[PDB]
Each structure stands twice: as structure tokens, then as C-alpha cells.
Amino acid sequence: DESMSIDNLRGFVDLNVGKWTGSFHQFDGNGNLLHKIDTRLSASSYGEDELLSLNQSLYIKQPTPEWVEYKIKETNMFTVDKYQQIGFFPKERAFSLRYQTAGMLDTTLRQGVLGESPRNLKLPSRRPSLVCENCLYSKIDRRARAFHIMDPKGVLEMLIVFLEERGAHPVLDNAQNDAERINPFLGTWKGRSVTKRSGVYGATLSEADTVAVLEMNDKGQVVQDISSTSDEKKVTTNVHWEGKMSKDLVTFAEGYQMTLLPGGMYMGCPCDVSKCVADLKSFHLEFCWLESPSSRQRLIRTYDHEGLAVSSTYFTETKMKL
Numbered sequence: 134d135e136s137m138s139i140d141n142l143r144g145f146v147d148l149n150v151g152k153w154t155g156s157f158h159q160f161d162g163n164g165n166l167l168h169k170i171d172t173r174l175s176a177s178s179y180g181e182d183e184l185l186s187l188n189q190s191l192y193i194k195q196p197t198p199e200w201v202e203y204k205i206k207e208t209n210m211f212t213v214d215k216y217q218q219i220g221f222f223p224k225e226r227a228f229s230l231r232y233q234t235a236g237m238l239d240t241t242l243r244q245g246v247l248g249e250s251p252r253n254l255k256l257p258s259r260r261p262s263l264v265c266e267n268c269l270y271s272k273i274d275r276r277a278r279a280f281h282i283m284d285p286k287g288v289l290e291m292l293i294v295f296l297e298e299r300g301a302h303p304v305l306d307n308a309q310n311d312a313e314r315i316n317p318f319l320g321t322w323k324g325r326s327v328t329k330r331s332g333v334y335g336a337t338l339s340e341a342d343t344v345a346v347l348e349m350n351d352k353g354q355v356v357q358d359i360s361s362t363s364d365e366k367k368v369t370t371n372v373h374w375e376g377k378m379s380k381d382l383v384t385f386a387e388g389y390q391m392t393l394l395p396g397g398m399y400m401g402c403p404c405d406v407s408k409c410v411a412d413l414k415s416f417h418l419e420f421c422w423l424e425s426p427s428s429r430q431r432l433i434r435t436y437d438h439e440g441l442a443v444s445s446t447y448f449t450e451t452k453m454k455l
Contacts (some may be wrong), residue, residue, distance in 0.1 A: 137254050138333045139183055142210055144223040146187045149176045155297030157241055162289055162315065164381035170194060170245030171302050172295065182443045183210055189236065193244040201244045205237060207213040214333040220434065220445025221415060222327065226270035229445045235264045235282050238293055257291060258284050259376045263406060263440060267420035267432040273274060274299045279400055279420040287406030294398065300444040306395035314381055317426045321346050322416045324450030326361065331442045338444060339363055345450060353378045406440070427452040
């Protein structure tokens with residue numbers, strides 16, 4: 134079974150290698166763009182087989198073009214398993230990673246906005262409780278890498294989106310509508326999901342046919358239904374949530390929250406991760422990205438009540454007509 138881990142490690146490496154020109158975006162909980170920073174990402178590989186490693190350099194554009202280099206922590210067979218708890222989907226081209234620290238994001242904000250630590254700049258906490266990356270690929274050769282960051286008490290402090298294309302700087306907020314951001318998400322989406330246990334091996338725990346329903350009335354009340362039917366296990370689960378929308382942030386009474394972003398993205402996480410932990414409950418983070426107004430991908434990162442990522446779930450969905 135060791136051969137499976139090596140084949141998967143190479144799959145992860147090869148999917149990253151290349152030159153990535155991209156744009157860093159820092160949002161708050163209400164989807165407000167705080168800073169957009171030009172970035173370049175150079176990913177290459179070294180070694181072979183079980184010693185295969187992914188080295189990558191992040192280049193950040195400095196304000197008034199000079200670039201400053203950040204050396205990203207090396208990714209190898211040891212790190213993906215022990216440190217990053219990789220959730221990796223080779224066929225679907227998606228992955229989730231844990232970061233121990235938000236330092237790489239702290240440096241990007243510093244260098245891209247500035248030349249002590251000023252106060253008009255929202256820097257990530259020194260010891261955040263959770264830093265999670267979720268990455269989806271488009272079905273052109275570009276990707277988006279979404280980051281959740283929660284403060285030491287488990288409350289969301291920022292959202293980050295790298296929009297990157299391989300082989301200039303990509304652009305989000307491509308709107309010509311000034312329409313409500315949630316609209317293309319409203320409706321009925323059906324498709325399939327596949328849940329992989331985290332870890333480099335990437336065992337498939339299950340697969341299912343999914344039905345996602347999202348609605349909002351004129352009063353601003355949101356209704357969400359997620360249906361998941363497993364054929365093999367003969368199980369069907371329905372989950373129905375109700376919440377309120379206000380300034381690009383849906384707050385469910387559950388209480389989960391999804392903030393809706395430019396570019397056909399939204400990101401979900403609990404209001405207070407610490408309540409889940411205190412309640413001895415599981416929780417999840419979510420990153421969604423639609424390519425067209427009728428086709429989207431979702432990535433869900435699932436944690437146990439101790440804040441350990443236990444599995445990742447990939448969704449590919451198409452919007453039904455009304």
C-alpha cells in the first residue's frame with residue numbers, strides 16, 4: 134500500500150508545478166475586498182519516489198515594479214501526512230491543506246501593502262486556531278486557493294483567495310450586474326460527491342449523489358437543503374437549515390455562516406469554532422466556486438471536535454432549470 138502513497142504524492146506535486154501568475158485577495162467576513170495584491174508563484178519538484186518534494190516560491194509585488202520572495206515551507210511525504218493532513222483528489226483536481234501558521238499570508242499582506250506592525254492593516258493572528266486551504270481547479274488551466282483563518286478563540290478573522298493561472302494577473306469581481314452575489318447560487322443543484330479520508334493515502338470512505346437547494350425570499354430569509362444518497366450503503370440524509378442574509382453574509386441559526394464573494398465564490402465556516410469544540414461536536418469549512426451560471430465545484434473540510442481534519446469532500450454540481 135506504500136505504492137499508493139507515492140503515486141498520490143506525485144499526483145499532488147505534478148498538479149502544482151509550473152509558473153503561476155495570480156492575484157491575492159483579502160476579504161473580511163462580509164465579503165469586503167480589503168486588499169488585492171499582485172503575486173507570482175513558482176512551483177517546481179525535486180527528488181523521486183518516496184523522497185519526492187515540492188518546492189515553491191511566492192513572489193509578492195511591492196507598492197511604489199520590484200518583487201520580494203517568500204520561501205514557502207517545503208512539501209514532502211512527511212509534511213503532507215503529519216503536518217498538512219492533506220485531503221487530495223487526483224481525478225477531480227482538488228485538495229485541502231492545513232497550515233500550522235498564517236505567516237505566509239502575514240508576509241504577503243505586509244509586503245504587498247507596505248515596504249513594528251501598523252494598525253490600519255489587518256494582519257492575521259500570531260497563533261491562529263485554524264488555517265485551512267481549499268483548492269479547486271477549473272475544467273482552462275487556472276485554479277483558486279481559498280484560505281480560512283480563525284483567531285485563537287475560533288472566530289473567523291479573514292478570508293483569502295489566490296486566483297491563479299498557469300503559463301496577466303487574473304481578475305475576480307468580473308461583474309457587470311451589480312446584482313446580489315448570492316443569486317447565481319440560488320436554486321437547485323444536483324451532482325455527485327466523494328469523501329476522502331485526510332492523509333496522503335487518500336482512502337475513499339464514500340461517494341454519493343447530491344441535491345443542494347438554496348432559496349431566499351424578498352425579506353432576506355435563506356433556506357438551504359442538502360440531500361445525500363449513498364447507493365452502496367442504502368442511506369439518504371436530508372439536512373435543512375434556515376438563516377438570514379445581510380451584507381453578503383448568510384447567518385444560519387445552526388450556526389454556520391457563508392460569506393458570498395466576487396467571482397462566483399462563497400466560503401463557509403462556523404460562527405464560533407470554539408462552541409463546536411466545547412459542545413463535543415464535529416464541524417466543517419467550505420469553499421465553493423462556480424465556473425458558469427449553471428456549473429460549480431465545492432470543497433468541504435471536515436473536522437472532529439478536537440479541531441483535527443478527518444476528511445475532505447469534493448462536490449461537482451450542475452444547476453437544474455426552473
